[PDB]
């Protein structure tokens, strides 16, 4: 089977009440390509309002949960709240979060296998940083935040998962990695895929791109073997959100 194409809108900490109101109204009006599953993720207090309010061909993500069902861990969500409230996604392990919380390869693995346990399909983030790059060393960075996930999950568990592969340099600065670099990067995982985890995974699993991109570059990393989609920042705020999500038309 071909992979299903899939767009997801990160909006990381901003929004209001209003603000979020118009961002799904525009949403809920356009015309979207329906062979692409397309998921938002808004901060964890307007869950209730976008699930809500938003159109439901559309699912709603969380940008992050904790490792546990529950327990004393004063400002932390588990996933099983997640799947109380009807949020089937999380986004796991973006760089934000490994950067300026600190989580580690190990943690990220952690908090992907009890959201899979608790009945979330995951968005998993990965990527290297700019001297990782600059060193040429994208493939086994990469190659390593693979294998800590693999660890902590099953052959089968990897259903449920979307690989968003996010060059850290690329996130939020408008500089956009080319279709070449981010096809061999897709290509690599793709390949440690079927080496490590199985064939039928490698050929089954998103590998969705993120970092700078727009509606101008979207078409032609599309158009790349082995990207699945995309994860949008800042873009998803913007109407060419509505763009990228018909990026192959």
């Not at 194409?5 to 329906?34: C, H, P, R, Y």
């Not at 899979?116 to 990965?126: P, R």
Request: glycine share 8%; aromatic share 6%.
């Amino acid at each position: 089977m071909a992979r299903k194409f899939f767009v997801g809108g990160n909006w990381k900490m901003n929004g209001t009440q209003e603000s979020i109101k118009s961002l799904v109204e525009t949403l809920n009006a356009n015309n979207l390509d329906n062979k692409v599953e397309v998921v938002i993720a808004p901060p964890a207090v307007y869950l209730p309002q976008v699930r809500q309010q938003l159109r439901k061909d559309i699912q709603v993500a969380a940008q992050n949960c904790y490792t546990k069902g529950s327990g004393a861990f004063t400002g932390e969500i588990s996933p099983e709240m997640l799947k109380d409230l009807g949020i089937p996604w999380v986004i796991l392990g973006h760089s934000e979060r490994r950067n300026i919380f600190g989580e580690s390869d190990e943690l990220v693995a952690e908090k992907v296998k009890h959201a899979l346990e608790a009945g979330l399909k995951v968005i998993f983030c990965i990527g290297e940083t700019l001297e990782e790059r600059e060193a040429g060393k994208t493939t086994e960075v990469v190659a390593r935040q693979l294998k800590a996930i693999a660890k902590k999950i099953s052959e089968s568990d990897w259903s449920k998962v979307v690989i968003a592969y996010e060059p850290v340099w690329a996130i939020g600065t408008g500089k956009v990695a080319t279709p070449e670099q981010a096809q061999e990067v897709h290509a690599a995982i793709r390949k440690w895929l079927a080496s490590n985890v199985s064939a039928e995974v490698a050929e089954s699993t998103r590998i969705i791109y993120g970092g700078s991109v727009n509606g101008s570059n979207c078409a032609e990393l599309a158009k790349q073997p082995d990207i699945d989609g995309f994860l949008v920042g800042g873009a998803s705020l913007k109407p060419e959100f509505v763009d990228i999500i018909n990026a192959k038309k």
